[PDB]
Amino acid sequence: KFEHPRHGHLGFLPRKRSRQIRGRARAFPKDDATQKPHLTSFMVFKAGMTHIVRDVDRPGSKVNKKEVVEPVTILEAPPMVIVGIVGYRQTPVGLKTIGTVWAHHTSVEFRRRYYKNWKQSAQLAFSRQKQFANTKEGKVAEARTLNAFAKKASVIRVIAHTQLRKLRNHRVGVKKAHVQEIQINGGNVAAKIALAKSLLEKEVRVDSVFQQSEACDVCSVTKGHGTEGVVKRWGVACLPRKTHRGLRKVACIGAWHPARVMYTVARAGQHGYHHRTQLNKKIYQIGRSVAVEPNQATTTYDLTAKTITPMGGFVGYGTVRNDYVMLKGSVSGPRRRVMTLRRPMAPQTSRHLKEKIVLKFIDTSSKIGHGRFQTKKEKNQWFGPLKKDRIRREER
């Protein structure tokens, strides 16, 4: 008889706190040995959002026509320092690591990750591996396992961490290094270590991994809300105003049989702070740093000079100082939470996902307000030498 479509999605149970804030790709793309060895993932930090105006393509009705305002997300992406190389056997109980070569140097932020205090400690992390690397048996026991990553290995995963001393953001209160294994999806695993062995202990910047107009998948950890009730966690319904013992509940959570509450009925508990993936988030610009190009947000039709950082920074994040990546739309983070990009799974051959992009406008109007001004040198033009600077720029 009467019914409705079921509330919430059973394929995101249990609604549980993710085991770490670090967004972590559960699966990397299928290894097409017909490609070149490359890096298929990258960790960025969610700065915040803004929106942009685009010259549209893909002839439809709202397309092949005047521009469009589409909301975007700014993800600050400093270059990642590769430290290790990790290979896996394809054994009948699923992949298993067959060793891990490290670099000879290992940044002081990486070694913090193997601690939880690091300032009362004695900093012995990787002490007998720096020493033993300078040995000869070290070089033996290192090429003995690199000559293994070709015999036994199929999956080769460098270990990259983030540069945070290169991320002058303070509101990212952490000084450890976020450590992430990254798949290499080239071919001829012999030539797959060759990449890994090469870029080891070298910085990997995000445009080396990704290109501008193509889409990624964003492994991330949702913004947490603590214990949310049934109406907020599952979005079931509110009982009528007349209800006793209140109305933000599921009335019937079980028949007489089965005489147990089902895993399908809605209950209150952890909402948010879940690991999500957000397939097919399309990059619109992968612009470089202000230290190298202090004209981030001025493409061709905003011949003024400006940067991505809005007037007064991104709210609750700061200024973007590094190789930001501009996606399209939502990303399952709060500000300054590490996001992991990933090259996508989908066939991606479409006139709605493989089309190239030019951005005719970006908004740097302040997040903190309403903002009516781009590029604060426009605000000074609206006003005059008002009494704040008048009491300083006329008192000399």
Partner: protein
């Protein structure tokens, strides 16, 4: 069709911006709506609805008839990124197939209702 925000649930009294005699357009049900549970059928800016006139001439009153929304007092975000809306709800009263039926509209018909009804725009003083 468009991504117009919905403004006029079933049972809304829209007024008639069409010189056919009527004054109100008590929304009977939205033509084209696919039912959902406990969800009131909500008209939008371009939607064609079925109406009964609650005020105006009697030659069209006690009768179910059609209507196309002209104006929407609820702000819908245009896809060009411009959130726009009207002083007042408004709807032409229309042929069951869809045709103008009534003296050219006394109001600024919106873009989302003209390019879904080639017979309305040709009677509307302004388009906005």
């Amino acid at each position: 069709r468009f991504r117009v925000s919905v403004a006029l649930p079933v049972g809304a009294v829209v007024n008639c911006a069409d010189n056919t005699g009527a004054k109100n357009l008590y929304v009977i049900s939205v033509k084209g709506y696919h039912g959902r549970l406990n969800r009131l059928p909500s008209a939008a800016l371009g939607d064609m609805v079925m109406c009964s006139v609650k005020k105006g001439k009697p030659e069209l009153r006690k009768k179910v008839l059609n209507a196309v929304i002209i104006r929407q007092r609820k702000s819908w975000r245009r896809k060009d990124g411009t959130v726009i809306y009207f002083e007042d709800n408004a709807g032409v009263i229309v042929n069951p197939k869809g045709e103008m039926k009534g003296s050219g509209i006394a109001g600024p018909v919106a873009k989302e209702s003209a390019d879904l009804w080639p017979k309305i725009s040709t009677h509307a003083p302004a388009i906005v």
